[PDB]
Design a protein around this ligand. Structure first.
Ligand SMILES: O=C[C@H](O)[C@@H](O)[C@H](O)[C@H](O)COP(=O)(O)O
Ligand SMILES: O=C[C@H](O)[C@@H](O)[C@H](O)[C@H](O)COP(=O)(O)O
Ligand SMILES: N[C@@H](CCC(=O)O)C(=O)O
Lengths: 651, 640
């Protein structure tokens, strides 16, 4: 599920430097999870580089990139010092789908025993059964039980049955994808097209990074259907191309990338990058604000720990350039060309999955208060099962850190067909949801490498609060309320630091629950979402049965679980539901429940009457959710560590 | 909470027949509160009834009503052989949501150590904090920490400062209620006013039953302001029954008078003035009410459709809506507000409501609906699902929506309930009294009722005629299919013996069966006390699935509808995690049955009705798990 190819055109690189670059790339893709990896590069030890462009070498292995890196440098009859003026190396980390992990099932997949064509693939070819039967009937021997091998054997079939002896590499791949069905991200290499690469995608991300000390011919690559029309360095030839399924494998070399779209066929021929279609439109060369530092653990022992403790910083990034604390105004540039239409709509629909859905639940109330519109928060999978009524005056938000979640994306396309105005709240540039929405409000929390959503939840939280502030910027009666909320956002990053400084108090609680199998997290109002999110975090990370219960529903059944044995965590803040939360607390205690209470620092009443209490600082009622969810993020983290679990391991 | 009093006027009863009538009344009301109980009756041991009304007796004991019935028939200082020609006895069972269920906090609450004024109360006083300081400054002590003792200590303050030496008992009560805030339903007794009973209400049920072999004076008692009262014409033989519910009175008589807010009933000299079927409540042959009500669903479902669904011509007529259905159709959004199982009923019918009405359908938990101050508009139709018609949050949501001009519809199982009265129109689900503590037949009747409403909202759409026929045919066949599900009772019990020792179980479903897995998880929480949780199958891949291993029990629902393939994927994910789940599926689903060891095979019905059949196995499962764990399915812990 990880792609990375490095094409150095007239930028001399030794075989070692090339291989180190490929390994270095896959290391940026490990966090996605994998079971095997491999590389493809020109073999041969001829001192001259061009004479070796007819001998493709493969080194694949079931295991981790480290073991692959060892297998690379641990080779004989492979001189690592040969200098290549032009070379294309491809690398891939595999997530086994068809065929058990193994060296032969690993990528790159080859077209024959001489490696005339090789390909790396992310996705699934649904119709690989029919295609395999055909190529077998035409005389092609398959060695692996993967769907990918179909792609390698097929491009050779097009090459073997080509009309002219000089048909373009692009043409062959075009004829390949036309027969493929499903989702894929592909990178091809062939001895018959030395130094050339061809990338194409359908339902799977694929981008191309570029670097050159010389001026490039354009920043908008025009499309070519079946010169001035392709990207290249102007006065010289030196250039470096980086194909990748994830920007994290590219950002250390360059931040100029091109995001391919479905059925695009990008080709590098003679060092010049062109983009071909079948069927003026074009693909932009854009600058990413991402930095290598943002995807490194740093001094933290895990990504989960880093992304939790850097939340004072990611909250600020989410507000940067949008909230003016000098005159207390909000401006989301992403909506400038749609805000006037959004304010004439009659309903907000928030559609997401998992923790992204919790972000909607966490901001529904304030959205209702400031927009005065109906606000429906839907789970994308259910939203689709029911064929929910959607109308042309609906504003449908789509919350997705990745921007690729299937159900959320399908919900987007469902709402577009019904004429609704779609808004994306993503954390991934170039993602499907950011592209297909009419407009977006990028979360701007930096990449999330951890398996669970920590800083993404809080940055989504803030993003919707800011939108809510935009929707009432013209209402006199709400000026004070907006000022209150914005002072809270001004003070929020320092309050997050204050909560993180209670990490010791959370560890003592993780020790209290170390042996427990269940825990009930109770809350209501602004902290309903805190229950659901904390309970999901503890489920996902700790593997214990944590459940979020709406405090107002205890009397209707769930209160029967409370006794002297069941652990309970209650959230009680100083908002308008304080009196009702005290009642729930009295119901729990009356049934021999001894709960842990997450309450306000100055809530002296509950602190003296409750043994263990996490005392978070006070914020505005519609922002407390961020501060009260953090102790639950840490609790899940510390419980997992206590139990010997790897928090960064995606179980 | 429950209220019951027995006032026999010129009907000689012994002290045992009265005490056995107070306990017999609390047993009829025990399902509203079984944390503590008490009885208030005249003490003393004289050779008549004209010298025992100066010293009242209180027997209050912790626990259910059974713990009180024994504290009465054991005291070595009480002769249960005295004859009373006139007597008044008040009883009460309490739901101690706060503090301890101790005897002192139990009712009746007294006004002093000599039991001058005793009172029974149902509700909350939203200002006892201020009244407690006003009473403590005049020389009154306080023995308990309940908001109900303030009612006894205050009625005495109005008696120690009365103007004339002949002020009526009603006058003393009218001055009290004027100083009380909130809701309350009171029934007073004293020594100063022997045999006199005063009953008032304000936001709480309170009726008065009347039995007498003599013709009563009138059938419409007139209200009085500060041929007038109800009494037997010929002689003076009459029996009154103050009660907070009609179940404690049907056993003796069916002639009641439903009081109203601020009414102040008063029985003076056996004269009642106002100021300003038994089989349905019997277990029959079942060991518990819950089991009866589950096996009764074939009948309750029919009763819900009776006189409303014509299968010969495929007609659906809900008489309760005949004066609003045309205005309901011009509306532009549906909102379902309820709590707990009633909320699940909305989740279980949301999809079909969206399908047949083509309107937005929003389902809200009343408690959260209020916390957020949800936007509501004049063209909204707000449904309030409430078996009892008295749930506080659902009722407050009703008054909230009314203030904003929405059209309100009640879906209740109780005639005369608050929600029934305050809504513009109602649809009584007519499922019969639900005595079990968990809602079983009420859920499936609310289910059917909303489906019938959906069928009305599309009766003029040509494109939906066939879809309507499909559903109504399913409703015709539903009672027999419910019976088929109940024939698997023994098969469900065996699976329960495999899970009763487990601490958790995940119930997974999607689409029409999201509600099923939510309702099932609640039932297993409520009566078995296992940590059961409902998980939307489509959400497994987003975190919760990490909780599944070969040890975590899992129940899945895989029915034959448009989500079958997706449900198969969720099942394949569970297995990959070494899960060994119990799958509720269709009988013809041979694929699922072959590849899954444990399967509960329910018959196929219409996709929008399958939820009724898929929840019943989970109802029965909760029952058996509770029995296996040694619990009483009736009277679970920590609530009522
Ligand atoms: O801990 C939460 C997980 O990260 C997961 O629940 C996530 O929130 C969903 O899978 C939605 O994914 P997107 O936000 O990328 O759409
Ligand atoms: O099994 C659960 C109970 O039945 C409970 O969830 C009940 O539904 C609510 O206490 C309100 O229900 P009503 O409002 O209909 O009384
Ligand atoms: N379906 C291919 C590729 C899967 C992937 O890595 O995305 C395989 O299992 O080999």
């Amino acid at each position: 599920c990880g792609i990375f190819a490095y094409l150095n055109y007239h930028v001399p690189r030794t075989r070692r430097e090339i291989l180190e670059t490929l390994i270095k790339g896959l290391q940026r893709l490990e966090y996605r999870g994998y079971d095997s990896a491999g590389v493809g590069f020109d073999g041969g030890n001829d001192k001259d580089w061009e004479a070796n462009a007819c001998k493709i070498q493969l080194i694949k292995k079931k295991g981790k990139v480290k073991a692959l890196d060892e297998e690379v440098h641990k080779q004989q009859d492979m001189d690592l010092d040969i200098e290549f003026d032009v070379h294309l190396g491809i690398a891939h980390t595999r997530w086994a789908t068809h065929g058990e992990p193994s060296p032969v099932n690993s990528h790159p997949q080859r077209s024959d025993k001489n490696n005339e064509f090789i390909v790396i693939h992310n996705g699934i070819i649904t119709n690989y059964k029919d295609l395999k039967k055909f190529l077998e009937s035409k005389g092609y021997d398959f060695e692996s039980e993967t769907d990918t091998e179909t792609i390698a054997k097929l491009v050779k079939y097009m090459y073997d049955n080509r009309e002219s002896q000089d048909t373009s590499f692009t043409t062959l791949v075009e004829r390949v994808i036309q027969q493929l069905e499903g989702a894929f991200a592909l990178v091809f290499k062939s001895v018959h097209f030395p130094g050339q690469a061809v990338g194409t995608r359908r339902g799977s991300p694929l981008l191309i990074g570029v670097r050159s000390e010389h001026k490039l011919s354009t920043d908008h690559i025009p499309i070519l259907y079946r010169s001035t029309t392709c990207l290249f360095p102007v006065e010289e030839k030196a250039v470096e191309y980086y194909f990748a399924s994830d920007a994290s494998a590219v950002i250390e070399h360059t931040n100029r990338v091109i995001f391919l779209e479905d059925d695009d066929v990008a080709a590098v021929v003679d060092g010049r990058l062109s983009i071909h279609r079948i069927k003026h439109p074009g693909r932009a060369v854009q600058t990413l604000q991402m930095e290598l530092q943002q995807i490194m653990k740093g001094n933290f022992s895990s990504f989960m720990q880093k992304e939790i403790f850097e939340q004072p910083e990611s909250v600020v990034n989410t507000m940067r350039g949008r909230v003016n604390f000098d005159d207390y105004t909000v401006n989301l540039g992403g909506l400038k060309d749609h805000i006037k239409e959004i304010q004439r709509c009659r309903r907000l629909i928030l559609i997401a999955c998992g923790t992204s859905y919790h972000a909607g639940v966490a901001t529904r109330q304030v959205l209702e208060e400031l927009t005065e519109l109906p606000v429906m928060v839907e789970l994308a999978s259910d939203f689709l099962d029911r064929n929910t009524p959607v109308f042309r005056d609906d504003v449908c938000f789509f919350l997705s850190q990745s921007g690729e979640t299937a159900d959320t994306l399908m919900g987007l396309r469902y709402c577009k067909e019904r004429g609704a105005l779609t808004v994306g709240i993503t954390n991934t540039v170039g993602s499907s949801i950011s592209r297909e929405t009419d407009c977006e409000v990028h979360i701007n929390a930096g990449p999330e490498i951890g398996v669970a959503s920590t800083k993404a939840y809080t940055s989504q939280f803030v993003s919707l609060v800011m939108f809510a502030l935009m929707m009432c910027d013209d209402r006199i009666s709400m000026q004070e309320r907006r000022k209150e909320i914005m002072l809270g956002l001004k003070r929020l990053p320092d309050l997050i630091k204050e909560v993180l400084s209670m990490d010791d108090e959370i560890q003592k609680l993780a020790t209290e629950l170390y042996h427990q199998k269940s825990v009930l997290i109770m809350g209501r109002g602004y902290h309903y979402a805190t229950c659901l999110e904390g309970a999901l975090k503890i489920k996902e990370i700790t593997y214990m049965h944590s459940e979020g219960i709406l405090a107002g529903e205890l009397k209707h059944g769930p209160l029967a679980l409370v006794d002297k044995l069941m652990p309970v965590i209650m959230i009680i803040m100083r908002d308008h539901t304080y009196a009702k939360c005290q009642n729930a607390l009295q119901q729990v205690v009356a049934r021999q429940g001894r709960p842990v209470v997450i309450c306000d620092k100055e809530d002296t009443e509950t602190i003296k009457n409750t043994k263990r209490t996490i005392k978070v600082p006070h914020s505005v009622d519609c922002l407390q959710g961020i501060l009260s969810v953090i102790p639950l993020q840490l609790l899940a983290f510390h419980l997992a560590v206590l139990r010997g679990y790897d928090v960064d391991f995606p179980r």
